[PDB]
Amino acid sequence: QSSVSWPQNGSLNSVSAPLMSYTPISFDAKIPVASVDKLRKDQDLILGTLPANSEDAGARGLFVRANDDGLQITSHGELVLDLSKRELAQLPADATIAISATEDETTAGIEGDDSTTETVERDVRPIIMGIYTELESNAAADLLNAGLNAHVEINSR
C-alpha cells in the first residue's frame, strides 16, 4: 500500500497522485549480446528497473549487469541467469538474451535453444519505477536494429 493526502503544504492547489512504483503484471526484455560492449566506461548497467540510489534497489528491482565476471541478471534479489566471461565470449555475436518475469516464474536464456534457459520457479517479479541504463547514447541505432527492447504490463485496479 501507498498513500496520498490533500491538501498539502497549507494550500488548496490541485495535486497529482501518480503511483511511483509497483510490481507489474509482467516484465520482459530482449537484450542483444552486443550491448555488453556498448556500455559507458567503468559502468556495468545494461538495464535496471530502479534508480541506483533507490532504497534496497538490488533486492527489489530487475538488473542486467555486465562486467569482468561476465553477465548477471537478478530479479527482486534472486539470481536469474549467470554467464562467466568464458560463457560470454562463446555466445554468437548476434545472440539475444530474452527475459520474462511473470507471477508464476521468471525465465532468462538465449533466444535460441532451450538448453540455455534459466528458470526461477516462483514469483520474483521486480519492483519497477522505470527503465534505467548505462549504455552509450550513440549506440541507440545499432542496438535498436539488434532488437533491444523492454516491455512492462501493469494492471490498474
Binding site annotation covers 151? yes
**Considering the complex, what minimum distance in angstroms separates the CB of residue 104 from a second copy?**
12
What residues contact 34, with CB distance under 8 A and at least 6 apart?
Answer: 93, 94, 142, 143, 146
| Alpha carbon of residue 139 to chain centroid | 18
Distance in angstroms (rounded) separating the CA atoms of residues 20 and 17: 9
Q: Does 61 bind a second copy (CB under 8 A)?
A: no
Nearer to a second copy, 115 or 156 (CB): 156
In the block, cell 501493469 appears at 154
Map residues 131-150 to x or -, x wherever contact with a second copy holds by CB under 8 A: xxx-xxx-xxx-xx---xxx
Task: Please choose, out of 21-29, 55-63, 69-77, 79-87, the segment that lies near a second copy by the rule CB under 8 A.
Answer: 21-29
Q: Are 50 and 152 in contact (CB under 8 A)?
A: no
130 touches a second copy (CB under 8 A):
yes
Which one of residues 76, 97, 98, 100 is an interface residue with Zn ion (CB under 5 A)? 76
CB atoms within 10 A of CB 115: 7
When asked if residue 54 is in the footprint of a second copy (CB under 8 A), the reply is no
Q: Which of 73, 101, 124, 128 is the binder for a second copy (CB under 8 A)?
A: 128
Chosen from Zn ion, a second copy, none, partner binding at 52 (C-beta under 5 to 8 Å by type): none
Q: How far is CA 52 from CA 4, 67, 148, in A?
A: 25, 17, 21
> Whole-angstrom Cα distance, residue 39 to residue 25?
29
86 belongs to the binding site for a second copy (CB under 8 A): no
Q: Which positions touch Zn ion (CB under 5 A)?
A: 28, 76-77, 151
